[PDB]
Amino acid sequence: STGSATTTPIDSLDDAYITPVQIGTPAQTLNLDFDTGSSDLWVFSSETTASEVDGQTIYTPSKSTTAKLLSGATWSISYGDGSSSSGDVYTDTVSVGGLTVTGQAVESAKKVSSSFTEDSTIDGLLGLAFSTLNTVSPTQQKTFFDNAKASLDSPVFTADLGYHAPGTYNFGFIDTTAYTGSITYTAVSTKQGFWEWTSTGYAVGSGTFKSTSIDGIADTGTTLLYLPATVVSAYWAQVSGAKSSSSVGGYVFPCSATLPSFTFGVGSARIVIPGDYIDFGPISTGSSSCFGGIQSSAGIGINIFGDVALKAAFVVFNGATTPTLGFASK
């Protein structure tokens, strides 16, 4: 089997992407944030504290003839950005882009943090990291991909995120029309539960390429590109007036600037992020200070190849017995 679904930016900055997901019988379609940096499929629901729901579409398990309480199971997650959610668990039928999994754990939120409430466009998350990170207790549950894997034509999914435009998540096949040149594959460590890999270096603009190993995670659920302070400083030094602002919480730059590109290495191959992808707009409405899309990972504890990086590529998440990651230009 295969599946193919369009993913759409939630706003004009590409802060996140939402993908429609069918849950239950008859289908309840919710727009979920597909997140290769976590492993829980959780939704706003009829059980979510009423004051914490503000415009989201909810899953109502009592209206699904295929829903079953997963008795005794609870979940609780905290994300790298400080947001969180928790609740109980149902199993139900879940379909993405025509690919159907029966008995998928659907984690129903009883509580969500304010950042989730405040984002009306995101009805929940669909985790695509390794199932070892799933938070359900006392019986850990499998991701949608893990459940689908054996049925797929090939045990892969691909992320093709758009810049200020829709893109595509495919399951079970590689669309050879969706990228240019060849796909370069690189080793993955699953030791921390992430799609963790090592970039071979970087360049800023038309500058020379610096060969250096940068361990990080491929994370569709993180907006920005978070890299070591040395790398980030080298980038912003090429933008007149750019500075790190402790009050704002990262590098800002004059909105009048033209940003240089940023290149990262994948083996001997190179992925070029155009300068415009690095612009996250005014820090507040009307400001002439703009927020940068490349930020320091210092104090995160890990480098994160988030959407800024991934949307410059066609990315293969190869879930074979020994997983790997592939990147192509597009």
Swiss-Prot record:
Question: What EC number(s) does the entry state?
Answer: 3.4.23.22
- GO terms classed as biological process: proteolysis
Disulfide linkages recorded for this protein, renumbered to the chain, are 255-290
Catalysed transformations (reactions): Hydrolysis of proteins with specificity similar to that of pepsin A, prefers hydrophobic residues at P1 and P1', but does not cleave 14-Ala-|-Leu-15 in the B chain of insulin or Z-Glu-Tyr. Clots milk
Give the highest taxon in the source lineage.
Eukaryota
Q: Which GO terms describe its molecular function?
A: aspartic-type endopeptidase activity
Q: Active site at which residues?
A: 35, 199
User: Could you tell me the keywords of this UniProt record?
Assistant: Aspartyl protease, Disulfide bond, Hydrolase, Protease, Signal, Zymogen
Question: In this protein, which residues make up the domain named Peptidase A1?
Answer: 17-328
The UniProt entry's sequence similarity note says: Belongs to the peptidase A1 family.
Protein name as it appears in the record? Endothiapepsin
Q: Which organism is it from?
A: Cryphonectria parasitica (Chestnut blight fungus)
